[PDB]
């Protein structure tokens, strides 16, 4: 023994890899009701039905949703009855007890998709598993009914029983290492390019212009995106639970929805404020003084921290479904509820109001290019390009998960709750864009070379 390294092998986790775990009743591959942990419900199709078997096996209302706690012991209870089943069973114990501990794994996992007298019923892959055959019974049971509805898991369970050896599920463990240390990366460009930003600004005169002080509120917002946002989500993913309570787990949430509504209205404010300073430049410095944008980037974060501290420290954003109101009790669940009054209304202040202002600015700059005193010209297609990285990246990282952030709230159970984070981090990674956007300036660029050479 002695070993505590990463992934031990065991049916435990590689159970967990096929079913994967799910607090609320779903519909399985095949339409059953199931919960937890790949726990088959009941074979009845209305939902009530599976309530009222879950609320038996649990002793409790569940409302059809169970705790972490709960799941984990109907995980290990399925798991404990179809090793009880492998050992009743005629045609499964000679074969078990045949089997070495990895193939061993293989044939519970079965057993706990199938139930003991549906694995008992491949007799002649039986027969083949008795005998040590794994090449000929790997090409025998890929021509089942089983490997036909879950192709995936039964691959993997096929080459477990083929090869012996867990590398149909070792691989996922180098995917857990890749996903940290590219949350490294991030959370190092985000911190590295913003606070390079802020300090050209403030330690120098030639980059204090009006623009550059929309841009310094955006690498601010940037800049709590690396420190604070960032590495909480990444200790939540990685971890798969919070540990720091309750008050902090809103708290993170309420600096996201703060950082992420100012960072996408400063970046709408940057939009038209190129827009005056190119179509009409010399109102642009009589009206626009250092006082009214400093107002102008107030108006931004006031906006910004009602949409976001003021209804989430104060519940408003709450769901009430009953995942919602455990999440909201365990001080380990810090997962993102929300009703749809609030996915809707954050979306337009954080996303889409600024989008549209966006969209149209940006491209009347170039209709309003066109109607000047004067020919198919070669910087109108560098300009042309230089919108397009303006408009293609900030596009690609925040509209996939705006998108989803409504329609999570419209039909439930449309939007898997791994593709909204997905999206999610999507739209973090343009904190660590925009400094490579928006601060290409010769006087920035001059001011890079002399932070870091000098
Ligand atoms: C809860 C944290 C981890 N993610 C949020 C969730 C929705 C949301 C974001 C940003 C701005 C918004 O307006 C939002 O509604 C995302 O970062
Ligand atoms: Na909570």
Not at 157 to 162: A, E, G, K, L
Not at 258 to 263: D, E, F, Q, R
Not at 309 to 314: A, D, R, T, V, Y
Not at 320 to 324: I, N, S
């Given at each position: 023994?002695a070993?505590n390294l990463?992934?031990q ?9 096929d079913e994967?775990?799910?607090?609320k009743?779903?519909?399985?591959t095949?339409?059953?009701?199931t919960?937890?942990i ?6 009845s199709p ?8 879950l ?5 409790r209302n569940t409302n059809?949703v169970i705790?972490?706690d ?12 179809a ?13 078990y007890?045949?089997?070495?501990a990895?193939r ?15 694995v008992a ?6 027969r083949m ?13 890929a ?8 192709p995936?898991?039964?691959?993997r ?6 090869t012996g050896?867990?590398?149909?599920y070792?691989?996922?463990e180098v ?6 240390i590219?949350?490294s ?9 913003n606070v390079l ?8 005169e030639?980059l ?5 002080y929309?841009?310094?509120?955006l690498?601010?917002?940037?800049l709590?995106?690396?420190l604070?946002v ?6 939540h993913?990685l ?9 902090w787990?809103?708290?993170w949430?309420?600096?996201?929805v ?6 996408i209205?400063?970046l709408?404010?940057?939009?038209v404020?190129?827009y005056f300073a190119?179509?009409?430049?010399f ?6 003084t ?6 102008i980037?107030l ?9 976001s ?6 519940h408003?954003?709450?769901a ?5 109101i ?10 993102f509820?929300?009703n749809?009054?609030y996915?809707?209304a954050?979306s337009i202040?954080?996303?889409y109001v ?12 170039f209709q ?13 297609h560098?300009?042309?390009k ?6 293609g990246?900030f596009?690609l990282?925040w ?8 329609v999570?709230?419209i039909?439930d159970?449309?939007?898997r709750?791994?593709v909204?984070?997905?999206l ?7 904190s ?9 300036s010769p ?6 070379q ?5």
């Open positions: 023994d070993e990463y992934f092998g065991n049916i435990f986790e590689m159970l967990r890899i994967g775990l799910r607090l009743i779903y519909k399985d095949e339409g059953y009701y919960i937890g790949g726990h088959l419900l009941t074979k209305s939902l009530n039905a599976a309530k009222s078997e609320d038996k096996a649990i002793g059809g705790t972490k709960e799941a984990e012991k109907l995980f290990n209870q399925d798991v404990d009855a090793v009880r089943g492998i050992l009743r069973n005629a045609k499964l114990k000679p074969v007890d045949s089997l070495d990895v061993r794994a293989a044939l519970i996992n079965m057993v706990f998709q199938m139930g003991e007298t549906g019923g491949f007799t002649n892959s039986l598993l008795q005998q040590k055959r794994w090449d000929e019974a790997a090409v025998n049971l021509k089942s009914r089983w490997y036909n509805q879950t995936n898991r039964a691959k369970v096929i080459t477990t029983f083929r050896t867990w590398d149909a070792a691989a996922d995917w857990v290492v890749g996903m940290g590219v949350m990366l991030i959370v190092l460009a985000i911190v590295f390019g930003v802020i300090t050209a600004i403030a330690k120098f030639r204090q212009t009006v623009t550059n929309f841009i310094t509120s690498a601010c917002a940037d709590v995106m690396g604070a960032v590495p909480f989500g990444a200790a993913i971890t798969k639970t919070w540990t720091f309570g309750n008050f787990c809103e708290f949430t309420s600096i996201d703060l950082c992420v509504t100012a960072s209205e400063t709408c404010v940057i939009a404020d190129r190119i179509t009409s430049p109102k642009y410095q009589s009206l626009l250092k006082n009214k944008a400093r107002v980037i108006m931004v974060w006031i906006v910004s921290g009602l949409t501290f003021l209804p989430i420290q104060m408003w954003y709450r009430t479904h009953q995942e919602a455990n999440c909201y009790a365990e001080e380990t669940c810090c997962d509820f929300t749809q009054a996915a809707i954050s202040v954080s996303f600024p989008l549209v202002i966006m969209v149209f600015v940006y491209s009347r700059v309003e290019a066109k109607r000047q005193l004067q020919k198919f010209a070669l910087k109108e560098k300009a042309l230089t919108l397009g990285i303006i408009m990246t596009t990282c509209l996939p998960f705006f998108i989803v952030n409504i999570h709230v039909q159970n449309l939007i709750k791994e909204y984070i997905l999610n981090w999507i739209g973090y990674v343009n660590g864009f925009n400094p490579l956007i928006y601060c290409r006087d920035f660029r001059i001011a890079f002399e932070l870091l050479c000098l």
